[PDB]
Amino acid sequence: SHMYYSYGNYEAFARPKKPENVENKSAYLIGSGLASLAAACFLIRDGQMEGSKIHILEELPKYVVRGGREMENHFECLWDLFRSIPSLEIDNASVLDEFYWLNKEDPNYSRCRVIEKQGQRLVTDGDFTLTKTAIKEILDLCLTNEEDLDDVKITDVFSDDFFNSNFWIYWKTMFAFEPWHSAMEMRRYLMRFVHHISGLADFSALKFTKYNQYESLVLPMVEYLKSHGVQFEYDVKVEDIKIDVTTSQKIAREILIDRNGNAESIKLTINDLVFVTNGSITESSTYGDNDTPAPPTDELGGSWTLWKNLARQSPEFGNPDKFCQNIPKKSWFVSATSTTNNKEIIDTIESICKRDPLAGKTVTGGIITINDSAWQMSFTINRQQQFKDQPENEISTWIYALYSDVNGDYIKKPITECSGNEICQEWLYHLGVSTDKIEDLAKHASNTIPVYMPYITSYFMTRAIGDRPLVVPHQSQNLAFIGNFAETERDTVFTTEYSVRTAMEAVYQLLNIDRGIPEVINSPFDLRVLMDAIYELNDHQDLREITKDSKMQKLALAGFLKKIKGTYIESLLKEHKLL
Amino acid sequence: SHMYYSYGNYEAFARPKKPENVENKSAYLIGSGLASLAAACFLIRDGQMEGSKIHILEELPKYVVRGGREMENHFECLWDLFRSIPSLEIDNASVLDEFYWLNKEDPNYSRCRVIEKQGQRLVTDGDFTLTKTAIKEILDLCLTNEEDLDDVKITDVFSDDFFNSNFWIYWKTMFAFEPWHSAMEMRRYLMRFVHHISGLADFSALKFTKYNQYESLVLPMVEYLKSHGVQFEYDVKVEDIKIDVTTSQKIAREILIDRNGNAESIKLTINDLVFVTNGSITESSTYGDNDTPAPPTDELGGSWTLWKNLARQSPEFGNPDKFCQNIPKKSWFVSATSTTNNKEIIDTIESICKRDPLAGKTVTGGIITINDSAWQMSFTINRQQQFKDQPENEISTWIYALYSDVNGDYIKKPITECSGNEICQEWLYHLGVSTDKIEDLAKHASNTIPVYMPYITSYFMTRAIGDRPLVVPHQSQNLAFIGNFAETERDTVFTTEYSVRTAMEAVYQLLNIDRGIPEVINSPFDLRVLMDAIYELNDHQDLREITKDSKMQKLALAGFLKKIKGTYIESLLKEHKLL
Amino acid sequence: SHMYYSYGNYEAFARPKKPENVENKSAYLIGSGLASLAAACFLIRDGQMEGSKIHILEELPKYVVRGGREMENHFECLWDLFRSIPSLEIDNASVLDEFYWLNKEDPNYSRCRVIEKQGQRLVTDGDFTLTKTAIKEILDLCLTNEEDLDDVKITDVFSDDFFNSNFWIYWKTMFAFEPWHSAMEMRRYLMRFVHHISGLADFSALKFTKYNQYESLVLPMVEYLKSHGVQFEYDVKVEDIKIDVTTSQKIAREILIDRNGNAESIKLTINDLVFVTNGSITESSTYGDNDTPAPPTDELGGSWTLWKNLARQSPEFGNPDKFCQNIPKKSWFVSATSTTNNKEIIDTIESICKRDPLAGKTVTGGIITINDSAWQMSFTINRQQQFKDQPENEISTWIYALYSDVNGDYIKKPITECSGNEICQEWLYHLGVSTDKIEDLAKHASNTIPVYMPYITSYFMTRAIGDRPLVVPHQSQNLAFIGNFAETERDTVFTTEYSVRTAMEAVYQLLNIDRGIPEVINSPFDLRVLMDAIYELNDHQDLREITKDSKMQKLALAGFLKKIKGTYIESLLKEHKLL
Helix, strand or coil: CCCCEECCCHHHHCCCCCCCCHHHCEEEEECCCHHHHHHHHHHHHCCCCCHHHEEEECCCCCCCCCCCCCECCCCHHHHHHCCCCECCCCCCCEHHHHHHHHHHHCCCCCCCCEEECCCEECCCCCCCCCCHHHHHHHHHHHHCCHHHHCCCECCCCCCHHHHCCHHHHHHHHHCCCCCCCEHHHHHHHHHHCHHHCCCCCCCCCCECCCCCHHHHHHHHHHHHHHHCCCEEECCEEEEEEEEEECCCCEEEEEEEEEECCEEEEEECCCCEEEEEECCCCCCCCEECCCCCCCCCCCCCCHHHHHHHHHHCCCHHHCCCHHHHCCCCCCCCCEEEEEEECCHHHHHHHHHHHCCCCCCCCCCCCCEEEECCCCCCEEEEECCCCCCCCCCCCCEEEEEEECCCCCCCCCCCCCHHHCCHHHHHHHHHHHCCCCCCCHHHHHHHHEEEEEEECCCCCCCCCCCCCCCCCECCCCCECCEEEECCCCECCCCCCCCHHHHHHHHHHHHHHHHCCCCCEECCCCHHHEHHHHHHHHHHHCCCCCHHHHCCCCHHHHHHHHHHHHHCCCCHHHHHHHHCCCC | CCCCEECCCHHHHCCCCCCCCHHHCEEEEECCCHHHHHHHHHHHHCCCCCHHHEEEECCCCCCCCCCCCCEECCCHHHHHHCCCCECCCCCCCEHHHHHHHHCCCCCCCCCCCEEECCCEECCCCCCCCCCHHHHHHHHHHHHCCHHHHCCCECCCCCCHHHHCCHHHHHHHHHCCCCCCCEHHHHHHHHHHCHHHCCCCCCCCCEECCCCCHHHHHHHHHHHHHHHCCCEEECCEEEEEEEEEECCCCEEEEEEEEEECCEEEEEECCCCEEEEEECCCCCCCCEECCCCCCCCCCCCCCHHHHHHHHHHHHCHHHCCCHHHHCCCCCCCCCEEEEEEECCHHHHHHHHHHHCCCCCCCCCCCCCEEEECCCCCCEEEEECCCCCCCCCCCCCEEEEEEECCCCCCCCCCCCCHHHCCHHHHHHHHHHHCCCCCCCHHHHHHCCEEEEEEECCCCCCCCCCCCCCCCCECCCCCECCEEEECCCCECCCCCCCCHHHHHHHHHHHHHHHHCCCCCEECCCCHHHEHHHHHHHHHHHCCCCCHHHHCCCCHHHHHHHHHHHHHCCCCHHHHHHHHCCCC | CCCCEECCCHHHHCCCCCCCCHHHCEEEEECCCHHHHHHHHHHHHCCCCCHHHEEEECCCCCCCCCCCCCECCCCHHHHHHCCCCECCCCCCCEHHHHHHHHHHHCCCCCCCCEEECCCEECCCCCCCCCCHHHHHHHHHHHCCCHHHHCCCECCCCCCHHHHCCHHHHHHHHHCCCCCCCEHHHHHHHHHHCHHHCCCCCCCCCCECCCCCHHHHHHHHHHHHHHHCCCEEECCEEEEEEEEEECCCCEEEEEEEEEECCEEEEEECCCCEEEEEECCCCCCCCEECCCCCCCCCCCCCCHHHHHHHHHHHHCHHHCCCHHHHCCCCCCCCCEEEEEEECCHHHHHHHHHHHCCCCCCCCCCCCCEEEECCCCCCEEEEECCCCCCCCCCCCCEEEEEEECCCCCCCCCCCCCHHHCCHHHHHHHHHHHCCCCCCCHHHHHHHCEEEEEEECCCCCCCCCCCCCCCCCECCCCCECCEEEECCCCECCCCCCCCHHHHHHHHHHHHHHHHCCCCCEECCCCHHHCHHHHHHHHHHHCCCCCHHHHCCCCHHHHHHHHHHHHHCCCCHHHHHHHHCCCC
């Protein structure tokens, strides 16, 4: 009870007092990821901790696109943070100001979503094509308690009708689900993005940065932190943190680090806070080129080794083996990015996405799903250029495939065995380019850089409660867990919001900052949102059309409309066009 | 349209673009009320209009408490405004920053709410004592459409069971309802403060400023506006504004003013905005003293004359005669404020409110309702001192009475005929002070200043749709109506929020500022809020105890719990202690 | 939480670590009572706080017995404290060592308990004479929840049969109950002393000090504290403690004291602990002599004024007016002590108590109840001499009367109007002394000093939960409430155990000392104890004799003995002579 959830404008603009004894506190932060830098910015801003007392420990010494960085308006903790962060492109404005102004003048929306048979758009695009049984299973999943879904796969809760629907095609590609993933984590997405079901197929509710998130989010935060004098230590490899787990309290006592190849230790008091980003989804990422495949691997890196060393000291520090071990070989492993300036590939893209890729505006609106591909290939093109020095005549696309062990259509090899051009070979095949000019474009007019992330589907692995540590574990004094693998309430992993939210909850609990953490948006608990979900899920159908065939449901519906005739409920029903 | 409602932290911290053609636009603002000054601050901040283009027109040239200034956290538009306003008491903080910090180190709560029999606390205090029929009428009021409630009184929808409840005692005094008031405006309060029902009896949900709202709100806004060079014109008596109504658009052409007794005119273009505060509840306020009663009056002031002049120019500018005429004589007219340093008056209050009035903290927590009084007297004491130069040994209390034509208990005269001491005579009588030393305490040990507001109940008068003009009327170009008498969506009059909201909606619609106006909070459409309301309305009773007597409700409930056994709904029911 | 209850020898002999940050902490203790000095000893011993950081604030500058100080073996927190306290009589031993050795060589037991008709022992002595309905009401009281007994009087739960029993005669005189006292506090005594029901009439389970508790308990603790350098401030009158009760935490900020007549202030940090003994039962005690009555009064003293000042700052600091106000005039107010060396009074005492009063051993074993007296007079004689300078030929007895407003039998005056001799006049009347030589013995051969405690029955006043503050209130940082008026779990007020227990709980919670506080003994939860209670309450009767008349209870009993025949339960039944 060191924190409380709040919402509205009262706690949003309120600044908290400087919490007690902060001037004698220090903070050690492992990693320089999004969650780590977010916690460093909260300590400077809300904790009012001076910059010399904050230490950032980074592994590394002092064109690839990491796609999937969808954002929406209700990332409450992200915009709380990216308010005081000054931007690096325009003056006298924040990172939110650029993000707000850019997404209001160029709204993001996709005029094409799913293509099949080598170029043709899907005929049932836009519709969800969910059967009544399929919608029933969606409601049953949402109505099951989270504690009852321990180690439950997606296939354990859904049937054949749901997976054959266009809803699952949109769902499995936006968020990169697999059928063997966590039902808890899918249930969280259903509750979190229930207010965006209308803007699900066409990506109207998605918001994107001007560039990649490294330069749009991380670099502004790095510059903000360095302006406050935050100490950055480089070439520091953290082996483990000595935790003494007593019957009454847990303190991080000492951190064993490898500073520039020299193994030595930093001592800790109860005042010296430690923020741990347990796990990493980009760890041990091998790279390739247009000529050679990215070599597969499963070597555990520093972030996973740190969690495995911490998990031994206490059972409520989590089970990293539920995520980093026994990842199915069919799962998403290989992502590719392709940079080209060839005109007829762009024209082939323009024939599908109905927009000019070199225009400097929204190009694809999001991702394009190849339905007929055995790889389940999906590709996206963001607002070109995504990079500062990228020439204005070049576009950069991002290609990933969900299934990995299956042979492709144009190339009878798995994605893990395909080189950079061979990924671009099949990508041009499913765009409708003929089988004659396809080979020389990928090999000579295109440059494709594959990357093999072995842990890119870790956060969606089937888990039980307690497999992920709490953001601040029970009875903990200076140890906090942040990042996508730290357990918090009702929020959803693999979002930039979740890493920032866990950063905010950790700083607020450890420092006892008296300000409400903005809760996850109350979309599932809103009558208006739930009424829009019912209308959208059964393909824009009124209550009379939903129950037009079943006699029992129509009878209860007929009685219900008698009891609400000429009432405020009926006006709600009409104005959400459910009548 | 010209505006859109929004919620969340995305549109809260986002600064909008400078709208087009602003540097060629000017604004003329009638009055210096809260709504007028808020509109001037929004034009400076969100419209980025230079201060020389904004004119404030004030009637007046250049201890009394105007109570009823309840504030709660979900005044979304108010905290949006009082964010950039710097405070005048502490440095490097806003008005909200003081407001947040002062209501966290001294929370508001009432240790006594209703007293009767000359001092003793009401035995059923805290309980609502609502029957099932009474709660049914509460929900039926909420479930009727606002269009079907035109010119509908409170007594037209409620029965004797509701009026005999402790809920109605709390409700009629917090907001100063009368039984002959608008059912629309009561229905809006029920939906607006449905999330504060748990903190309704003890005032735990209310928030207060350090001083009176003139010095805590208006003076910080005045100093903010003066630092930006906003021009204040005094001695300006506005007769009418020339409005030409075409079939396509309406433009404020010319304003007729009486500048320091000199009748003259100011020209207007379409770029020159006009903000009219139609009507005023403090208009034609006669004052009394400790010896003479406040002289009753029914004289229309400048604001009501200005609205009556405008209403003849167009049918959709509203009907001011529905509010400023035919106010019943039993309605609230007289308010009194009593300043004393006498010990046994203070000690009598200390025995009732259970707190030290001179401590500088919460004293009464809000109002104290005298249940047995014929006047329906209710008095409040805020954080003393409420004024700057007031000596530290004095308290200043605020007394008002709802009924006005009935003789009091200690004094057999109506409140309209009682002098300052005579109001203090009966107030001390209902505090339990002995009726022998009561005379010289009011006459010599206390100073009471009555004030007669003839229009303090105008906003609650029974009305139809269109009786209040829209904030920006349909097809209007530079004319906007602000204040408590402008019609907006789902929000509640006689709050500081409503005047600020109508100020924001006017500035944003006229200037086409492309930023989401924060909507009224979605408490009535929230499942969690509604479930807490059901628990609190019938006095902390589970579903089984609510339906323990009716067989029809019991039978349907038993079949309902079988259908939600072991689901997320049942977890929602139990965590809100309804199950 | 911050403390945990434990029992057994593991946590008894275990010493805890020095808790963190103690060397920067200080403690201010109001009063020099038993609870205050006990908390000072726990800070020195268990908290390992150095003596210079502990301040004792005593109001006072630098032949009366305050009897009723019964002790028993299961005062777990008292013997935990009086282990390290060295004694002042014998060398190389503790206070417990003297108490243990003295109460095992001279066991306490009473050969006479109740006398009536001026000298004759009661014929039904030893027996309880409880009816089956009367025992049923005892079980019903014990089986009601404590939360369901708010403001419940003794007469509200018991009937005529219970008060006519000899059990109520023993109960009302040992603990000084009145019929208008708290049913919660009686229920606690029934559960606490359920294992001493056998030793109830004859006082076999009671233990007594060699002298009064001032030199048996307080002076050894004072000498122990002064040996550690504890700072004693004298002539310090505490008016109030400035508490700021925020929404998240409560800190004692500043204490307003009157040091030697000079009103000044001592500042506090969060580290400076404050221990408040709210209320006092010996406060405003007026004294008398042999010739004039002790003057009645009800003037609130310093300890009650401090609680009343603290109760205003927060509602969970208690309601002192439930205890110090509206004490019924029939309640116990006057206690008298009589010192004499006249031989025939001693012989009359010896004829009743069957033991030599000058022997230096147990004299009365406890108290003697006058059943026929309208005053309900009870008198006791402890191990003479109770005082060091008291001559060896003198005995000192202690007389108190429960009813106060009723005229006595020998003297038709209330006890409040009787002088010292007049109390001794009626005391000799009920001892059987002739009505002729009675007058000159009290007036000339005896010296009786009355004392009027107006608040001696405060702790038994009817209360609700929350009327007494928690030992450490919720969300409190350096403020703790100790003494008989602080609320703790399952323990019983007006015992030396309770004041020491609340001292231990306060020190352990505030300092976070990691050692189990010994729980209140588990006698009500023990099968063996409950079986002995059933045997003793119905006057040493087997199960067959208990239900030998009721056919319904015999039927269930007959089937019960068939199910447990030849089992361990039957052996338990036989060895506790219930079967």
